Paper text:
[name] [name] up to three distinct [name] enzymes: NanA, NanB, [name] [name]. [name] is an unusual [name] in [name] its primary reaction product is 2-deoxy-2,3-didehydro-N-acetylneuraminic acid (Neu5Ac2en, also known as DANA), a nonspecific hydrolytic [name] [name]. [name] adopts [name] same overall topology as seen in NanA [name] NanB, with a CBM (residues 85–271), followed by a catalytic domain (residues 272–740). [name] catalytic domain adopts [name] canonical glycoside hydrolase family 33 [name], six-bladed β-propeller fold shared by viral, bacterial, [name] mammalian sialidases.
Structures of [name] have been determined with Neu5Ac2en, 3F-β-Neu5Ac, [name] OC bound at [name] catalytic active site. Thus, many of [name] Neu5Ac2en to [name] interactions are also conserved with NanA [name] NanB. These include an arginine triad, comprised of Arg-290, Arg-600, [name] Arg-662, which orients [name] ligand in [name] active site via electrostatic interactions with [name] Neu5Ac2en carboxylate. [name] ligand sits on top of [name] catalytic pair of Glu-584 [name] Tyr-695 [name] beneath [name] general acid base Asp-315. [name] latter residue is substantially closer to [name] C2 of Neu5Ac2en than in NanA or NanB Neu5Ac2en complexes: 3.2 Å in comparison with 4.2 [name] 4.5 Å, respectively (Refs. 23 [name] 24). [name] most significant [name] change observed upon binding [name]/or formation of Neu5Ac2en is [name] substantial shift in Phe-316 [name] Phe-396 of [name] hydrophobic pocket [name] [name] loop upon which [name] latter resides (herein named [name] 396 loop, residues 392–401). [name] Cα of Phe-396 advances 2.1 Å [name] [name] active site, [name] [name] side chain changes conformation, moving out of [name] active site to accommodate [name] ligand. [name] net result of [name] movement of [name] 396 loop is [name] it partially constricts [name] active site. [name] movement appears to be stabilized by hydrophobic interactions between Phe-396 [name] [name] C9 carbon of Neu5Ac2en because no hydrogen bonds or other stabilizing interactions are formed between [name] residues of [name] 396 loop [name] Neu5Ac2en. When short Neu5Ac2en soaks were performed, [name] CBM binding site was empty, whereas bound Neu5Ac became apparent when [name] soaking time was increased.
Residue numbers in the entry: 84 to 471, 474 to 740
Amino acid sequence: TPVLEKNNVTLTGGGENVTKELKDKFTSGDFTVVIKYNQSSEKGLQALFGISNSKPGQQNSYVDVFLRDNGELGMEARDTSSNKNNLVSRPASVWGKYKQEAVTNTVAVVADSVKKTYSLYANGTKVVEKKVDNFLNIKDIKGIDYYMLGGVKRAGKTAFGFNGTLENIKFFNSALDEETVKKMTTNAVTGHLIYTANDTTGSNYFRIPVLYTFSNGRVFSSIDARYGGTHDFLNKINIATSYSDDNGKTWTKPKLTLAFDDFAPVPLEWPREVGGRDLQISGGATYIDSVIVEKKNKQVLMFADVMPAGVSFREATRKDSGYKQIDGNYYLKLRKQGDTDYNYTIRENGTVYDDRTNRPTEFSVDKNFGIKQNGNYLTVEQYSVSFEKKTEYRNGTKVHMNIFYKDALFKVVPTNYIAYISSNDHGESWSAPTLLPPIMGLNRNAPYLGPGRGIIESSTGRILIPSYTGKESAFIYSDDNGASWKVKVVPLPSSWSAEAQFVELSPGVIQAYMRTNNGKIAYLTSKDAGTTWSAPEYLKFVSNPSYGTQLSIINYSQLIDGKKAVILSTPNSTNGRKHGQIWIGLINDDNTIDWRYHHDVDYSNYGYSYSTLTELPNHEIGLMFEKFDSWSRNELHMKNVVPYITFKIEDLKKN
Ligand SMILES: CC(=O)N[C@H]1[C@H]([C@H](O)[C@H](O)CO)OC(C(=O)O)=C[C@@H]1O
């Protein structure tokens, strides 16, 4: 039970003195403080409460919990005369605003002198726990004599003044246990996660959300389940999915849809300290960066990049497709252990052929890229990961030997591929993966997918899938309803990571909106359903760092102000992946777009990285996004940071 509980304390920087109420309550010196609050203004560093020695000379003798204007939650515990200064925090811990209202958050700190740890909670997640050698509790700090809500009294003056309402605050004179505080901090914000740390996927981390609405009214999601922290590479990554049959109100428990089992789908506590955060899982095959489209016959397609163990965007050979052409057919090539050349091909029925004799061997490759010998699977030992400093070790479980694995008898060229799977039941079940043929040419690697959706161009029925090479756009398309694939390769002005998404403006007229390396969003126009493309133009109202970020843009089915509309989601800040905005663009008779409305998702300094939009069956808009800066090295390996939210068009008109 609490030693003090206060309510509805509204403050504009001035604080409230609770010294009488708390002096003498903290007999051990340990504490837990649970704060339900909303901010009226996010600017500046703000303390939810402060326990201090307030006398002259003692300004570095206090304990607080604080909020920053970027959503970071932290705590300090400091003592002047011993020059001890503890700081524990996690970025991207709270929400600011949502549809014009201050968001209620619930945060907590626990100081446990027996464990010498400080822990912080926010909205049902333990965002950080840190053992510190210079531990300080209230009793360790010399001359504590002032206890304040909404500030810290330093040398007779209020510092870090809070602006908002403390809805409820509880002080306890002991360290409460993990499960209790998680539960006390659960609130509405907790319910915005579709994918959560250590859910059914077994992953602690997620990136790259995709939302898509099927013609039956199902709203479908996919995501990268990233097991070895949030690194793009090297990593062990599966694609997970989850769906809603009620306009997004409730979602299925995630399922694994594309996954390799050379490593198991198990939760790892990836180190966030500078000394460990660069660590990667290096020996494991992966699927990464998903694209969803629904065909006109209602079959659903999902594409993803395929990385063999040890391969990524960084390491993949650019000068080999991994295919060989033999008698006009293209066959995936293989190198056998102990050979220097690639002497083998996978041909009809998955039969592995020795290219030197042009005869079938006793080996074959199954529909999931697993290897058999005389009809029986070959196996290898699965890896697990251990920390103490990281080890990847053989764990004694047998999985099928696979051509994408580190320990295979036959291996593919160490480059990146694309695979696609199809579903005839709106994503309850999926075919085995098909690898894309060497559409870029035999002597070039596959392109890299632009995460989000593809489209069906309405006048031709052409299926378009966005991708990029690092130097060109690669618009993968089919003119036979997905039976065969070709590509339009478009050289770009510079080395853009050209993650793109399409809209259709009018029949036969499409635009590709994409990331660049120059700070702007580019759009290229085709008036022949993607066969030829204009020179790039640039949006004038978004200004981002040079590296860029993925965007989402969709067609919307309903008129807005009497006009056909598109809806765009992007960060908009030169300071980082921040300041999420949703823009409404109304299409004019002449196919120019009037970018008439924008909505700021949260405050400007709050994190906003990869995103995905979909129109719900009821004509509201669903948004999932990375609510953190996914470029920053300081925001790596964070749990429960990819929420789902919804807007009415009337919400999006405001800002
Ligand atoms: C396949 C892959 O690596 N995709 C990643 C992509 C890529 O590395 C970059 O575009 C190279 O320039 O970058 C990012 C990113 O947050 O910036 C995330 C993607 O998942």
